[PDB]
């Protein structure tokens, strides 16, 4: 919301959150290498891209659902391309830490 | 018309499946196929849905992109 | 075999449906697209799910949520929200028009184009129902949208349910706290609706709630976002023993028969405890006896009324976690030996105590801190008078000049309501003194 | 039977295509939003 | 849903539009060709409020464009996005105004007003639910308040539940921008008062005086207080069209403004504002934002508004904000400053939250309040009015066009008398 | 099956013809030549109605002209599309009429009958299953509401189980194009009551109305103004010679609109039609299709179709579209409007749709309605002939070719009548 200044950053800053934050809570079998070893089977070429309904649908196979604003944002910062296509080596190179 | 099946689902016995009926000791009418068709009945249909919502899709797009073509 | 339906009119229930029943699937840990990924479950068998949800046929699991609403734009918020795929398409019903916080509109202008529904809607839902234990109503009488409807929903539950006993959670407006310019009076005449029409009702005043945040929690800019989930937790304790095996569960039926001297005063009271979020939950010892005390604390009630100025008629504590039967009779012991709590002359023992085993579960990235101790309290005593005298403090001073008297006046609605929500109003809290006298 | 409707109704006499002296005009009060008046009560039942 | 069409009338009500509509664009995400190039849904989700659809996508606005002549008219068509209109919005006649409002209202107008009515017609009929009309006319000019008013007078009686919302202009007595300013302003008043609803008085006083001691800037043109204003309109639209905490739509704000059938007429203002030199050292919290608002140089009429007592008031926040902060700060207020509120309505200030701050800030805030500082205005356009007419100069032109001599004595009178009223509350004491 | 033949009479009713055929040729595909290059089956799927079969590929049209002076069918056959009349069918004599209702109709028409009686009988011989007859000519000109008049009131005398169609041109009231208007119009509309099963009356001040207003188009033409007309004659039949939803032939159409025997003149129209600057930035949906169908502007007639009631109204739906919308818009019209249609004639439109639509576009509509706003059209001419005839004012051209002035008397009656008696259910109520 409001992403037209630090915006792009400020949304993608709460969504990862939920994600770091979600994925802690169930603690459970969930592997962050789940979700790049599922990517590849939606890449096909393995061209590194998937449109926006592979993506939204590889997240939902891992548990986490977010609201229809949220992916918005998504789509604008990771499309480096400006294919409209987002890079999930990108998003999964993310959304993991450089360790204590 | 007629009556071909004893119940939708199960057809009549083999004559030899009863090879007692001598007594009301055996009814058939337990099931014991009860809980396990439930479930597998879940999943036929399901498809059923996912071969439609789809074609659903599909049939609003031709819809879509004429509207274009006209444009 | 036993299950519950929800009612959510207005904004204020529309915000807490939400965080209401969110709660309640991760508790089962129904997954948010409705196929929950299967479970054997740890209490209660795997039945638990029977009461908030019902089989699909084929996937998911439908709550029993209908919503009414007459404004879009919070109610279309949850069909794009994450939570697309719980809810059937056809029961978040949302009208066109608002009410623009009037209560004649509410309840005289444009009842029956969408009232007819809320009963069609809420029938066929019952019908799959064979058990019912009960309703719970919840909507917000300041609320512009909700009085009305509501009123009209109550009015009209009493014929289409008559014996269905019907529990309900309003929200009052807050002392000095406030948001409206008109909110009394939509609130004098929702509440003069829901004296004749509610076997069970509670209280829970905004700004109390807003309280505890500062003193315990240790947050210094709370949202509404924060207070749902407060509001979450106390139904989910009060619905416990549905479900979740316990050595002396309580059901909802045990609230219409046990927490009321008669049929007219039923304005009860809630507390919680303990609340304790886990920065300083290093140091507290958070056992029985102490969590016990904690729920007759004066600052902690739920409402901004001080107990310490009525009698305690009866009160409903139901217990959930590692307790054990034993330190619990000492809580009672404890507490009736402090003089401070007084209760009425006429009431011997005035305590039905509960009893569960699961805690509660979290809420992602929620505030509260998991404990193995929790107590819910239901509490109706003389104190709760004062709530409506300073409402009624309010609605004499204003009607003295008619002020913003005609635009109701142009809903249909006759200027004499008034005099009868006042003696209404009026009617009633000489009743709670004088039960509080004694013999 | 009688479908009485509310706020916005949808029956009129000149709703589309309608329309085909300096004298008049609004003396006092004509106005619906002036008459800072109250219309008479009416005791009122309740009791259903 | 529930959308509003807009009508502007008079080169103070035009020039609005070329303004008023360019940050409306801007907000959802329109661009000067109109494609929609929009990073987010939260800029769709209610984007039908203000515009209709077309081929190829192409958004229009819900525009209805009249006056007398048409030169004002020109300009607007050729600045950036006067290319959004389409031309059957439009209407011009032939003969001009003159600042008279008999050639406006009885003989003039009388034959134009046949294809706005029509065109005016056209639009509410094909929307999905009507909900109001938002007019900005000019009191100070002939076309204007002529055309302008009686454009309000005839819409309420086909219409009997629209609401309405009025943007006005009154002249202040400093800057005499027409002789017979006095005269038009209280023939304005007189059949406003019957069929507006809401009306909220700015005086060019304040845009001036905001463009100094406000904003610190050298050489503002029209189009900065036309900027000025515009952030206002669209203060008080945002919350019927994008998700918040409480949604408030222009009829939610009627209910708790007005204390008495008509004494209806507000008083707004917009925070917080600040210079190139002097917005890097404050600090940025609804607590200094709310100290603004409540400061009497900033508001946007000459009326003083220390002077009288508040009776009714609106909040309207914009951007994310915890109900606490803003809540407590209120009530704050209302306690703080007792001597300054009513005491026979309690809690007697509104608040709400909208979720879309303005692009380009962090907080801002728009406020709507029924304050009897409003008196100074009327009383002060009333000894004006009495003065003028004693010599019966300038009469004359108003005879010349059928009007007579009675209308001006009734007007006189009731303008009086709604002064008279508007006071009586001052003094009244539970 | 079911075809039909054509009669045009005068000057104005063959150059209206030479539109129609070149339009109607458009949408079948048939060449200049006569040779066939559609590109589907449909194309050539109901040819019969307004072709035969001719061995060499060229289809002939059943047309027959008549003038009673050469130029008109000179020219006619000049120009594009002029070779498709075949040369046997034309019938010319060699006076001429000179506007003189009398000589079209009594001195040269009366002699001429026999080949053009003949001629017409053998086409009407050659259909398998006749229809019925279309006829343009022209009230004000002479020889039109002469030559044309007679064999109409001649051939209801042979034919009477066919429908018979009149489209007619009566002459405006504000641009006039002869002097012996007033007298010539009468006379044929008297005769034209008696014997017409439906006469569809179009305007030209309109026309030019409708050019300047809706077209925007800068240098209109008669070409222009016979290009409108051309395309409703097509509009009223369409369906028919296409397959379709809901076929509804020229006769169903005399079924659903004539309310008693002596009202059989309607209004028509077409739309949508879009500027040379509004082409693009309009709307192209249902809702579009019934705002301009009942607007006043559109309609071809002089006459203001709010003076009165409509008695009764038929829409035909031309191409695809969701029929939803086509019945419940037509409901969202009755309701909103009931003051302006009479109470007694619950659920008074027509509807139709049909699933060929017009060359390079998606939707298209054509109206017809019989409307009681018709009166002030008769009047205005019933009340000019009143004016000339008190006086005897060229009455001897008429008196010195075999009239009595008792006939002009006894016409009047009957217009008179007809127009009291028309307005008679306007006051008349359930
Ligand atoms: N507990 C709680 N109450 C809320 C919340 N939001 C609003 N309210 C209450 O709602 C009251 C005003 O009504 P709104 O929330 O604006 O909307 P409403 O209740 O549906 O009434 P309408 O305006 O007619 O739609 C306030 O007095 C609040 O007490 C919330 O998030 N939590
Ligand atoms: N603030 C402001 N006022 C304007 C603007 N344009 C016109 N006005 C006001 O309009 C008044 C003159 O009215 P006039 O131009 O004759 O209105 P018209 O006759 O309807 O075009 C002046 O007192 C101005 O205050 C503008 O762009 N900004
Ligand atoms: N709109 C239009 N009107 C026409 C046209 N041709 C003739 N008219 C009308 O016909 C009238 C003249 O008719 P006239 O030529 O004398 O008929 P004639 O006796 O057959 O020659 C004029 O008043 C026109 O209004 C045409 O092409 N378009
Ligand atoms: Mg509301």
């Known amino acids: 919301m409001s992403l037209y200044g630090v915006g792009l950053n400020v949304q993608v800053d709460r969504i990862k959150t939920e994600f770091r934050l979600y994925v802690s809570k169930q603690k459970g079998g969930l592997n962050v290498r789940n979700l790049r070893r599922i990517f590849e089977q939606l890449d096909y070429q393995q061209n590194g891209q998937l449109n926006l309904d592979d993506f939204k649908a590889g997240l939902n196979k891992f548990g986490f659902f977010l609201k229809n604003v949220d992916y918005q944002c998504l789509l604008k910062y990771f499309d480096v391309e400006q294919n409209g296509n987002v890079n999930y080596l990108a998003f999964l190179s993310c959304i993991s830490q450089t360790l204590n | 018309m007629k009556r071909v099946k004893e119940s939708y689902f199960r057809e009549h016995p083999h004559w030899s499946d009863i090879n007692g009926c001598s007594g009301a000791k055996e009814f058939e009418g337990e099931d014991l196929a009860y809980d396990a068709r439930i479930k597998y009945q879940k999943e036929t249909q399901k498809q059923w849905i996912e071969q439609q919502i789809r074609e659903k899709k599909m049939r609003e797009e031709a819809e879509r992109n004429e509207e274009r073509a006209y444009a | 075999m036993r299950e519950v339906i929800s009612i959510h009119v207005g904004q204020g229930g529309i915000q807490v449906g939400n965080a209401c029943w969110e709660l309640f699937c991760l508790e089962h840990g129904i997954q948010p697209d409705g196929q929950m990924p299967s479970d054997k479950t740890i209490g209660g068998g795997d039945d638990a799910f029977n009461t908030f949800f019902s089989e699909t046929g084929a996937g998911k699991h439908v709550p029993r949520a209908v919503f009414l609403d007459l404004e879009p734009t919070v109610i279309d918020e949850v069909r794009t929200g994450t939570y697309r795929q719980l809810f059937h398409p056809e029961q978040l019903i949302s009208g066109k028009e608002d009410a623009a916080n009037n209560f004649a509109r509410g309840h005289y202008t444009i009842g029956k184009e969408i009232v007819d529904l809320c009963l069609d809607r809420i029938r066929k839902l019952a019908d799959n129902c064979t058990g019912l234990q009960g309703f719970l109503v919840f909507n917000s009488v300041g609320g512009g949208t909700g009085s009305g409807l509501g009123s009209l929903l109550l009015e009209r539950l009493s014929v289409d349910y008559g014996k269905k006993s019907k529990l309900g959670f309003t929200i009052y407006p807050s002392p000095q706290v406030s948001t409206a310019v008109v909110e009394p009076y939509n609130s004098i005449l929702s509440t003069h609706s829901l004296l004749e029409h509610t076997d069970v009702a509670v209280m829970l005043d905004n700004e109390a709630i807003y309280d505890i945040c500062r003193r315990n929690l240790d947050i210094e800019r709370p949202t509404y976002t924060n207070l749902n989930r407060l509001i979450a937790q106390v139904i989910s304790s009060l619905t416990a023993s549905l479900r979740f095996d316990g050595a002396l569960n309580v059901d909802i039926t045990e609230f219409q028969t046990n927490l009321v001297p008669y049929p007219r005063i039923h304005f009860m009271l809630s507390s919680y405890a303990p609340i304790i979020s886990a920065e300083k939950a290093y140091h507290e010892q958070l056992s029985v006896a102490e969590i016990t005390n904690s729920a007759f604390e004066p600052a902690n009630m739920m409402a901004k009324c001080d107990p310490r100025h009525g009698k305690y008629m009866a009160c409903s504590m139901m217990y959930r976690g590692d307790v054990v039967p034993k330190d619990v009779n000492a809580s009672i012991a404890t507490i009736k030996t402090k003089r401070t709590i007084q209760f009425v002359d006429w009431c011997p023992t005035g305590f039905k105590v509960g009893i569960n085993y699961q805690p509660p579960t979290v809420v992602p990235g929620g505030d509260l801190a998991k404990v193995m101790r929790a107590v819910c309290m239901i509490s109706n005593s003389t104190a709760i008078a004062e709530v409506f005298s300073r409402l009624d403090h309010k609605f004499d001073l204003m009607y003295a000049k008619r002020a913003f008297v005609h635009w109701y006046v142009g809903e249909g609605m006759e200027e004499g309501e008034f005099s009868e929500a006042r003696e209404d109003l009026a009617a009633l809290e000489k009743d709670y003194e004088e039960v509080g006298i004694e013999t | 039977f009688e479908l009485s409707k509310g706020p916005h109704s949808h029956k009129d006499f000149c709703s589309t295509f309608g329309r085909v002296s300096t004298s008049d005009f609004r003396k006092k009060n004509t106005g619906t939003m002036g008459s800072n008046k109250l219309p008479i009560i009416k005791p009122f039942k309740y009791a259903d | ?430």
Request: glycine letters at 8%; charged letters at 20%; a negative charge.
């Open chain 5, 1 to 430: 849903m529930r959308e509003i069409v807009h009508i502007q009338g008079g080169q103070c009500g035009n020039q609005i539009g070329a303004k008023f509509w360019e940050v409306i664009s801007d907000e959802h995400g329109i661009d000067p060709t109109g494609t929609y190039h929009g990073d987010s849904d939260l800029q769709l989700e209610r984007i039908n409020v203000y515009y209709n659809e077309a081929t190829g996508g192409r958004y229009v606005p819900r525009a209805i464009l009249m006056d007398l002549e048409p030169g004002t008219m020109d300009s607007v068509r050729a600045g950036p996005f006067g290319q959004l209109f389409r031309p059957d919005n439009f209407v011009f006649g032939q003969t001009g105004a003159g600042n008279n409002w008999a050639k406006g209202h009885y003989t003039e107008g009388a034959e134009l007003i046949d294809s706005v009515l029509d065109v005016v017609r056209k639009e509410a009929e094909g929307c999905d639910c009507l909900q109001g009309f938002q007019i900005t006319h000019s009191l100070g000019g002939g076309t204007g308040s002529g055309m302008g008013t009686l454009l309000i007078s005839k819409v309420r009686e086909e219409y009997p539940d629209r609401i309405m919302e009025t943007f006005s202009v009154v002249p202040s007595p400093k800057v005499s921008d027409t002789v017979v300013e006095p005269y038009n302003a209280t023939l304005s008043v007189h059949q406003l008062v019957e069929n507006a609803d809401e009306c909220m008085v700015i005086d060019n006083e304040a845009l001036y005086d905001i463009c100094f001691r406000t904003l610190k800037l050298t050489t503002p043109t029209y189009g900065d207080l036309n900027h000025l204003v515009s952030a206002a309109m669209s203060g008080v639209t945002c919350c019927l069209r994008f998700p918040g905490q409480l949604n408030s739509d222009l009829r939610k704000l009627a209910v708790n403004l007005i204390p008495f059938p008509r004494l209806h007429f507000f008083m707004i203002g917009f925070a917080p504002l600040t210079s190139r030199g002097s917005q890097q050292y404050r600090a940025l919290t609804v607590p200094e934002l709310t100290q603004q608002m409540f400061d009497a140089k900033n508001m946007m009429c000459a009326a003083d508004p220390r002077h009288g007592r508040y009776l009714t008031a609106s909040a309207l926040f914009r951007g994310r904000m915890s109900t606490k902060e803003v809540d407590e700060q209120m009530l704050n207020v209302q306690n703080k400053n007792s001597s300054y509120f009513v005491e026979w309505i309690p809690n007697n200030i509104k608040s709400s939250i909208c979720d879309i701050p303005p692009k380009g800030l962090k907080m801002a805030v728009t406020f709507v309040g029924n304050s009897t500082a409003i008196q100074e205005m009327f009383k002060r356009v009333a000894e004006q009015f009495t003065a003028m007419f004693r010599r019966k100069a300038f009469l004359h032109w108003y005879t010349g066009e059928g009007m007579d001599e009675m209308e001006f004595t009734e007007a006189e009178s009731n303008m009086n008398d709604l002064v008279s009223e508007y006071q009586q509350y001052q003094d009244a004491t539970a």
